[PDB]
């Protein structure tokens, strides 16, 4: 399936994944094109924060669903 | 100044905490005692799969905004 990852600049990016793909593996996929380590990535859906252990199907994410991304650039 | 962190029990109870990054593991447990009633004597906190030592800090362990800990009780 296909999903969209939205930043804060408005620069929405495309992606391709399976339901069985882990949250950790998704952040790694964004790194390959965006150049930001997974541990600096915060992924959001439906209002929930997503944990690096569940899968896409756990939070029940479908095709063409939007994810929101927050970067850890400043700590605290 | 203040951060928000989550503390997950294994009973499926999640408590939200207000902490400073500069806060110590001891103060965290004391905050857990303050609203939950569980003694610091009998608390054991986990982050990134490691136990957290009393004398150290939240920042020592790279605990960040909206991070999640697990709380395991001892007997």
């Amino acid at each position: 399936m296909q999903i969209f990852v939205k930043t804060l600049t408005g620069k929405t990016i495309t992606l391709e994944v399976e339901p069985s793909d882990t949250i950790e593996n998704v952040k790694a996929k964004i790194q390959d094109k965006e150049g930001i380590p997974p541990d600096q990535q915060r992924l959001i859906f439906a209002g929930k924060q997503l944990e690096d252990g569940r899968t896409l199907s756990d939070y029940n994410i479908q095709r063409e669903s939007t994810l929101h991304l927050v970067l850890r650039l400043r700590g605290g | 100044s203040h951060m928000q962190i989550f503390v997950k029990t294994l009973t499926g109870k999640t408590i939200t905490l207000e902490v400073e990054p500069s806060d110590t593991i001891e103060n965290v447990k004391a905050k857990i005692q303050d609203k939950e009633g569980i003694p610091p004597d009998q608390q054991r906190l986990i982050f990134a799969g490691k136990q957290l030592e009393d004398g150290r800090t939240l920042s020592d362990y790279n605990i960040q905004k909206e991070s999640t800990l697990h709380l395991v009780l001892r007997l």
Epitope: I36, G75 | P21
Partner: antibody, heavy 120, light 106 residues
């Protein structure tokens, strides 16, 4: 290994302008922020500006705001400090540095600094 | 803007430098050590935690609104200048305090 090498320092008339460069290596600047900080001879540190290269957002000290322009070029991995309306009191060594989320606001790597002197 | 203030101490002394602070400013206070001719080095971050490779004789503490740097027993290489750094979430401005130069008593 992380390195920050600043250049472009030197001599300007009051009123003149100058561009400082800060070339980074051993890490990618878009994974954090880059700061400029200056130190007048025999005096304390003074924060000047910071940029977050990934977004392009900036912040400036009061003593510098209307006349300095911090900026970054990700492809070159370099950060710049464009200094206009320069005045004698701007005389200092200028360091660039970086903050990485893991050190909770603190600046962990600093270059050796370049000398800017403003005088007629 | 100003010259650092001077502290006279002997090898083995306990030194506590304080950094006066505001309610506005965040408790993410950092400390740096700077030697003559060279760039500052990070000692303490987030008020009281040690940067990688900093000796244990360095500690940091929060005295209410104020923040402190302590060196429990002064070694010869500790004689230098120390700066606190503050950060405000409201303005996104950073500020370094005056700077304290510890010199050797004899």
């Amino acid at each position: 290994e992380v390195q920050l090498v600043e250049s472009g320092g030197g001599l300007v008339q009051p009123g003149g302008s100058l561009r400082l460069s800060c070339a980074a290596s051993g890490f990618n600047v878009k994974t954090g922020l880059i700061h400029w900080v200056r130190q007048a001879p025999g005096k304390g540190l003074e924060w000047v500006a910071y940029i977050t290269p990934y977004y392009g957002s900036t912040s400036y000290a009061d003593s510098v705001k209307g006349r300095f322009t911090i900026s970054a070029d990700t492809s070159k991995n370099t950060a710049y400090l464009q200094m206009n309306s320069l005045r004698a009191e701007d005389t200092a060594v200028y360091y660039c540095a970086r903050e990485y989320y893991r050190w909770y606001t603190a600046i962990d790597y600093w270059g050796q600094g370049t000398l800017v002197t403003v005088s007629s | 803007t100003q010259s650092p203030s001077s502290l006279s101490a002997s090898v083995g002394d306990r030194v506590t430098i304080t950094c006066r602070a505001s309610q506005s400013v965040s408790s993410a206070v950092a400390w740096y050590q700077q030697k003559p001719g060279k760039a500052p080095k990070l000692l303490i971050y987030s008020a009281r935690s040690l940067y990688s490779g900093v000796p244990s004789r360095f500690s940091g503490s929060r005295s209410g609104t104020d923040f402190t740097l302590t060196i429990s027993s002064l070694q010869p290489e500790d004689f230098a200048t120390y700066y606190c750094q503050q950060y405000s979430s409201y303005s996104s401005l950073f500020t370094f305090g005056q700077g304290t130069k510890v010199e050797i008593k004899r």
